[PDB]
């Protein structure tokens, strides 16, 4: 489960 | 898109007044913390190349808009479920009830939820939301899109949220209050009545984000 984009990690 | 028309008119109106193009600017006089949103998106995950978009709302509920335009929603008790199909058909159940038709999608929701929990920061954690109604529905993500500068998140309660990638600033627009909540780069939040910004003006940085907000709302209405 490695999403390309996301909110501020 | 009845709420979006109101938001467009509201944004068109404030931008036309040129709030930052004035000598006397007093944006504090436009503050109305009685208008803080009940709900905003505190975390999001764009995995739409494979599965869809997962998000967290400020109340700790989670949702995922899958690529097939179905929606799964986990309420903040971490157990209660709302499933919304494309045509609008909704189902209320639980994770623990173990419905076989939905296990593929439930498993995915848990992956999204886990990724957000251990990896991502909660936006507006320093904000207390407005109370709301015990009878009102949990809002869900109606639609969304990314530009090169921002993500745009449109909720079913009519609120539109814009998060800017470059400097972490965020906008929450509510057409029901005709209000905007601004989270700056220092994580400070202020809620403004839009009509009061036309009269009192605001700083250059808020005004340019209100200009950008309008373009995005145009995009939302124009995608229908």
Residue numbers in the entry:
A (entry chain E): 71 to 79
B (entry chain A): 371 to 594
Anything the authors wrote about it?
We have observed an unreported binding site in a number of crystal structures of the PBD, which is formed by the rearrangement of surface residues involved in crystal packing. This site is located close to the phosphopeptide-binding groove, making it potentially accessible for phosphorylated proteins binding to the PBD. The new binding site consists of seven residues: Val415, Leu478, and Phe482 form the bottom of the pocket whilst Tyr417, Tyr421, Tyr481, and Tyr485 form the sides of the pocket.
The thermal shifts of 9.7 °C observed for 72-DPPLHSpTA-79 (lacking Phe71), and 10.5 °C observed for 71-ADPPLHSpTA-79 were significantly lower than the one observed for 71-FDPPLHSpTA-79 and showed no significant difference between the wild-type and mutant protein. However, in the structure of the 71-FDPPLHSpTA-79–PBD complex, Phe71PBIP1 is found in the hydrophobic pocket. Linker residues Asp72PBIP1 and Glu7term also adopt similar solvent-exposed conformations, but only the side chain of Asp72PBIP1 is ordered; the backbone nitrogen atom of this residue forms a hydrogen bond with the hydroxy group of Tyr417PBD.
